[PDB]
Amino acid sequence: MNIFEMLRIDEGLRLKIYKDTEGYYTIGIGHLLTKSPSLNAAKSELDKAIGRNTNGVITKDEAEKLFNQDVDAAVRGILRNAKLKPVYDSLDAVRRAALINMVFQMGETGVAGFTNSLRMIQQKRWDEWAVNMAKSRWYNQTPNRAKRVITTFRTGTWDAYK
Structure with a gap:
């Protein structure tokens, strides 16, 4: 994965x-x-x-080309962002992937705005973060996908995708 x-x-x-x-x-x-x-x-x-x-x-090739572009923009977005970069830098690879997925979906600014959320992640408070994200519009709007990402982020495993 x-x-x-x-x-x-x-x-x-x-x-x-x-x-x-x-x-x-x-x-x-x-x-x-x-x-x-x-x-x-x-x-x-x-x-x-x-x-x-x-x-x-x-x-399909065209879809794939937009996809490569979008994933790239998301990674670069994280990396240029003052609030996101340090978060990214502190995580393992699986959790980094989950953060990329959120930015891809919600955008840089969107994620960078979940102030409290970020802090929890920084303090490594996995469970609380998770409980917390579940209150978002994001989660209420597309629960299954959100639940997959949240679980990924929380556990640091790809279990939800398996």
């Missing part, structure tokens, strides 16, 4: 534009196109991201 395998499981793979639980247009492996209710705007974002007239449908 690795970060790629982990997120692919969590986000699935769709070759055509779709709406997520929140109603946002997305494609590929968790790639957010736009928060606008316009499908046409979404189509425009896709074409610009892909570099071709897609008509709302991409190939």
Whole structure:
């Protein structure tokens, strides 16, 4: 198990534009196109991201290319962030992967804002962190995926993905 395998499981793979639980247009492996209710705007974002007239449908290779880009941005985001970097630096590899998954999903700013959450992680208070994250919108909105990530983060094992 690795970060790629982990997120692919969590986000699935769709070759055509779709709406997520929140109603946002997305494609590929968790790639957010736009928060606008316009499908046409979404189509425009896709074409610009892909570099071709897609008509709302991409190939697997294209999905994979957006995926590599997104995972990369997430790692670089952690690493450039003043609040996230030290957190990352203090963890083992499995827990690092869980943090990447959260940033990938919620974005840098999003994660960097869970002040208390971060502190717990820093103090190594695993269980409390876990209990705590379960109160988030994130967890209430997509409980199964969240539960997988939270468990991963908490235990430092890939058990939830097995």
